[PDB]
Amino acid sequence: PEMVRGQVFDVGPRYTNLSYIGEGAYGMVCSAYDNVNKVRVAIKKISPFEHQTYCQRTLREIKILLRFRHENIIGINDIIRAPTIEQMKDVYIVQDLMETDLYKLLKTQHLSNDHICYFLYQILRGLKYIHSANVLHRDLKPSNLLLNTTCDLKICDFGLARVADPDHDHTGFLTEYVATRWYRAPEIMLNSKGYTKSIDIWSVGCILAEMLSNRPIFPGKHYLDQLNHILGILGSPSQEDLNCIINLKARNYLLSLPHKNKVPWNRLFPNADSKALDLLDKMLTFNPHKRIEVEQALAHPYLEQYYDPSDEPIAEAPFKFDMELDDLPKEKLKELIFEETARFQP
Numbered sequence: 395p396e397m398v399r400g401q402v403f404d405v406g407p408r409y410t411n412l413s414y415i416g417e418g419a420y421g422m423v424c425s426a427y428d429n430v431n432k433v434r435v436a437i438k439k440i441s442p443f444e445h446q447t448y449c450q451r452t453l454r455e456i457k458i459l460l461r462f463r464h465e466n467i468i469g470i471n472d473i474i475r476a477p478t479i480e481q482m483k484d485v486y487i488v489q490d491l492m493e494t495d496l497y498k499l500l501k502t503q504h505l506s507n508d509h510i511c512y513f514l515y516q517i518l519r520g521l522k523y524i525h526s527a528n529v530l531h532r533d534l535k536p537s538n539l540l541l542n543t544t545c546d547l548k549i550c551d552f553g554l555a556r557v558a559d560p561d562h563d564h565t566g567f568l569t570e571y572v573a574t575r576w577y578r579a580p581e582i583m584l585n586s587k588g589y590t591k592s593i594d595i596w597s598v599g600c601i602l603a604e605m606l607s608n609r610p611i612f613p614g615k616h617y618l619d620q621l622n623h624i625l626g627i628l629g630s631p632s633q634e635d636l637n638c639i640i641n642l643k644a645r646n647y648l649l650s651l652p653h654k655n656k657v658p659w660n661r662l663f664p665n666a667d668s669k670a671l672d673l674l675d676k677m678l679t680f681n682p683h684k685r686i687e688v689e690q691a692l693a694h695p696y697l698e699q700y701y702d703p704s705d706e707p708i709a710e711a712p713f714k715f716d717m718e719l720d721d722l723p724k725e726k727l728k729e730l731i732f733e734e735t736a737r738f739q740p
């Protein structure tokens with residue numbers, strides 16, 4: 395077998411001429427020549443089976459992405475694994491190879507207003523489909539938005555995605571949370587488990603702000619500092635929005651803060667298009683009940699050049715897990731991953 399940076403990549407016969415791309419907690423990723431479709435592809439080697447949380451992330455990703463089919467969502471093209479559960483130590487997920495991501499692009503490139511508009515349209519078009527399947531992505535951020543050389547955009551990384559569950563969204567103040575700090579809606583720190591679609595709209599608002607200036611809008615250094623960055627720009631919540639926070643720890647924390655006025659978007663973003671700032675304001679609304687929904691955002695005058703609901707498809711039915719995954723042992727999640735990947739075996 396081929397090796398890459400001290401790692402076997404058992405992907406042949408179909409995939410050859412591997413080049414290292416990167417690695418992280420997930421595993422390792424390469425490009426490889428697909429000898430059936432005659433194109434280079436991404437293959438990520440995942441080795442999740444000794445960690446229940448990595449197994450969860452793997453299974454969520456596979457089940458969701460195999461059900462979804464959308465131009466602005468990364469697909470799974472193939473899955474390689476051993477023929478038996480006993481021999482299965484790794485899973486290789488094959489996906490379309492994308493040249494870069496929005497994180498890399500923002501570190502290195504000024505975006506024209508036309509590019510910002512087109513990226514935002516594609517993010518929302520993909521998100522319309524995700525939300526129409528009653529799924530929440532829950533970790534939208536620049537490094538999960540993949541881009542090719544013609545600026546086509548695909549949402550990736552569904553390892554934290556969940557079925558929406560608004561009736562069980564309430565929690566206490568300062569409840570620990572997994573998704574990337576800088577893109578967390580204020581309510582995560584106050585009273586929310588991140589089980590409603592409004593969580594993803596906030597992250598997209600944050601991404602829009604970051605496209606406007608190439609810098610994260612709310613770069614909190616730790617859990618509560620994230621809330622105080624948000625409040626630093628939005629200002630003190632209104633009495634009405636406060637009255638929606640019934641938990642006394644969260645409410646009394648907010649009441650304890652000195653009054654802060656809203657920082658106007660046009661001072662943070664003096665070169666931004668005024669319609670972009672109107673949409674930004676509506677996505678970065680403190681109260682999640684008043685926050686714009688994905689379909690409303692698509693209909694916003696900023697996106698009028700692109701908006702076409704007949705060409706913004708929805709999922710054919712709501713997505714549903716067979717059983718709850720959060721409590722399952724890692725050995726059971728391995729079995730489920732085995733069954734879920736069976737269709738790619740010859």
Ligand SMILES: O=C(CN1Cc2ccc(-c3nc(NC4CCOCC4)ncc3Cl)cc2C1=O)N1CCCc2ccccc2C1
Nearest residue numbers: 419420423436448451452455489491492494495550551553
């Ligand atoms: O696969 C993941 C998370 N990742 C990791 C990754 C790497 C690469 C790509 C990717 N990149 C590119 N092109 C890059 C080239 C260079 O410029 C940047 C873009 N093209 C296609 C893909 Cl598909 C996508 C992903 C992705 O989705 N998980 C499932 C297993 C469970 C788990 C366990 C532990 C932690 C996270 C996860 C989530």
